Ligand binder design. Sequence first.
Ligand SMILES: CN[C@@H]1[C@H](O[C@H]2[C@H](O[C@H]3[C@H](O)[C@@H](O)[C@H](NC(=N)N)[C@@H](O)[C@@H]3NC(=N)N)O[C@@H](C)[C@]2(O)C=O)O[C@@H](CO)[C@H](O)[C@H]1O
Ligand SMILES: Nc1ncnc2c1ncn2[C@@H]1O[C@H](COP(=O)(O)OP(=O)(O)OP(=O)(O)O)[C@@H](O)[C@H]1O
Ligand SMILES: [Ca+2]
Ligand SMILES: [Cl-]
Length: 264
Amino acid sequence: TLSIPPSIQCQTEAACRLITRVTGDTLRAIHLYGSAVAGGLKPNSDIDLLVTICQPLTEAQRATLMQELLALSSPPGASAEKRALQVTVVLYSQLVPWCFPPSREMQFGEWLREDICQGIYEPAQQDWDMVLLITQILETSIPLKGERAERLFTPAPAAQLLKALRYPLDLWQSTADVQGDEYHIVLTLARIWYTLSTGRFTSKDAAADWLLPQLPEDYAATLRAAQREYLGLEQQDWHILLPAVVRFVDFAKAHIPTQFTHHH
Ligand SMILES: CN[C@@H]1[C@H](O[C@H]2[C@H](O[C@H]3[C@H](O)[C@@H](O)[C@H](NC(=N)N)[C@@H](O)[C@@H]3NC(=N)N)O[C@@H](C)[C@]2(O)C=O)O[C@@H](CO)[C@H](O)[C@H]1O
Ligand SMILES: Nc1ncnc2c1ncn2[C@@H]1O[C@H](COP(=O)(O)OP(=O)(O)OP(=O)(O)O)[C@@H](O)[C@H]1O
Ligand SMILES: [Ca+2]
Ligand SMILES: [Cl-]
């Protein structure tokens, strides 16, 4: 039985209590997922939460939830006891039965603090990553509210999981597509490659270790630098590394499988 890390139990309980109070009778479930449960919880890591609701939130509820989550969350790395929160809200009707691509009602995150602090909220929108979120939750998650994931959601067809995995791959193209997110994108490409090759999901760090000995050394050096920064061991100048990041992205677009090698 998967366990909530003691060091996030208090904050996680407070988030669960807030989400429960604001959503009320529409709440179907709350699931903890991501590196807190699957492994690889770093000092800058956020706490990943999926909220499943039955009906869309009112305009006032969205504002209440967004504003109060701001007070429960801190920028990543600002505090060892008050982590960044990521809260994704989805309609049950978008997942059972599946809609492809599924829509997400709402997303809270620290990368939106400046907008959210002004009352600017993302509307409901289509998100291919929701297929990957649910797939990961089906394997590794904890129900803070409601039923365990395997009793609530069904697996997506492999054909849709493939499309969800390759969607960001086709979108990363230019220097500006990757600028500001260099090591994140390099590591996520490693996780995508891993999943398409083995059918499984794994941590950012472990995916980098899996891919490294398979790469020509020039691409291994870029992956090693992204891994080393993510592990907090060295902050690179990613403006100098940008051309090598672009080459890494192109290499992954050329070499990552176009079909599962080993389904999920
Ligand atoms: C939804 N989670 C947050 C989000 O992550 C995103 C992150 O997405 C980033 C793209 O790579 C980048 O090319 C894109 N850059 C562009 N020039 N388009 C970013 O804008 C995008 N970030 C974003 N929408 N907040 O890369 C994806 C693989 C992701 O992990 C999930 O869809 O954005 C990250 C910051 O960019 C946050 O750290 C995450 O918590
Ligand atoms: N093959 C993949 N395996 C895992 N995550 C993937 C994959 N492809 C894309 N992603 C997406 O990348 C994002 C990773 O989430 P997130 O950045 O919170 O990472 P994490 O594993 O929880 O680590 P961290 O401790 O840095 O938060 C999710 O949106 C996830 O769906
Ligand atoms: Ca996370
Ligand atoms: Cl860990």
